[PDB]
Amino acid sequence: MKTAYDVILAPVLSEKAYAGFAEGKYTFWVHPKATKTEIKNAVETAFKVKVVKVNTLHVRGKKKRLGRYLGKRPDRKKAIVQVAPGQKIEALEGLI
């Protein structure tokens, strides 16, 4: 199932995200490969919503290092999915 699997795994709840969801945009944690359009299908299968715009960017651990060698900027990607008007993914809306 190439849905929320490899592509968009779990949602990210944060000020820049919660106050962002405000418009319907949803940032997600996803593998460094889920083609932009692929992310559209990942949430469309689980969130069963309508993706009207998906913007993803590479995300690295906060200090991308944590003390001495103990992680180092890994390879993580974030995905912001927006849905048309009238829609609203409840996966992050009730995740507060």
- In this structure, is the dihedral angle defined by the CA atoms of residues 39, 45, 49 and 50, taken in order, positive or negative? positive
How many CA atoms within 13 Å lie on the side-chain side of 11?
21
Which technique was the structure solved with, according to the deposited record? NMR
Q: Domain limits of the chain?
A: 1-96
Sheet with 76-83: strands ordered across: 8-11, 25-30, 76-83, 51-59
Would you tell me how many other CB atoms lie within 10 Å of the CB of residue 93? Answer: 12
CA angle 12, 34, 76 (to 5 degrees): 50
Residues 6+ apart with CB under 8 A from 53: 25, 80, 81, 82
Is the CATH number of domain 1-96 1.10.3720.10?
A: no
